[PDB]
């Protein structure tokens, strides 16, 4: 559970701005190679419109649970995940994602 859970942070455009190193033991990516890239680059084609929809809920509500989606792994194949996302607004400044890996 805990060793399958990692955080990421995203700009409002969905780009990674930070990722736990734990994503390396789970999906193969190095956090540094993620930064600057949209989450979009990584979803399975069959999940993409759904994530766009969860995204819209996140922006209108401020927090949301993604429900189940696939991330293309660093060395081929897809890993299932469920994410809770939370918008950090200040005085939108970023999105915090708590990401739980459902599958190997």
């Amino acid at each position: 559970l805990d060793s399958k859970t990692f955080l990421s942070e995203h700009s409002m455009d969905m780009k990674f701005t930070y990722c736990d190193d734990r994503i390396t033991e789970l999906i193969g990516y190095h956090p540094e190679e993620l930064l600057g890239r949209s989450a979009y680059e990584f979803y399975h084609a069959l999940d993409s419109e759904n994530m766009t929809k969860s995204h819209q809920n996140l922006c209108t509500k401020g927090q949301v649970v993604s429900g189940q989606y696939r991330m293309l792994a660093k060395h081929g194949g897809y890993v299932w995940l469920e994410t809770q996302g939370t918008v950090i607004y200040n005085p939108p400044q970023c999105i915090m994602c708590v990401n739980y890996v459902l599958s190997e």
């Binding site: 680059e41 069959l46 993409s48």
Partner: protein
């Protein structure tokens, strides 16, 4: 029969900054579903790195044509084979950052 095709403009990073409305019939998205997003987000995982290196190269090619073939995810979530021919433009009265003009055609891979 006309090939189906639309023009787009991107910044050097790949982000769509202009989309010709012929895109609806070509890939099924409205212009605004494309504007502001990187073209690499609509690209097949096996073709993403080619497309990123294509954008990197078109800017070193002195405004000449670079062409690339890749699979683009239509609004039906089908993979369409795309040929994108691109070249840079930079107004020589200025020293503004060049941008990238693309023409995007649905082609047969065969």
């Amino acid at each position: 029969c006309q090939p189906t095709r639309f023009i787009s403009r991107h910044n050097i990073e790949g982000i769509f900054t202009f989309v010709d409305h012929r895109c609806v019939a070509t890939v099924g998205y409205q212009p605004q579903e494309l504007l502001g997003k990187n073209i690499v987000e609509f690209c097949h995982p096996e073709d993403q790195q080619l497309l990123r290196d294509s954008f990197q190269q078109v800017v070193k090619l002195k405004g000449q044509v670079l062409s690339v073939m890749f699979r683009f995810r239509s609004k039906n979530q089908e993979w369409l084979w795309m040929r994108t021919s691109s070249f840079t433009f930079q107004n020589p009265y200025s020293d503004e950052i060049e941008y990238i003009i693309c023409t995007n055609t649905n082609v047969k891979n065969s």
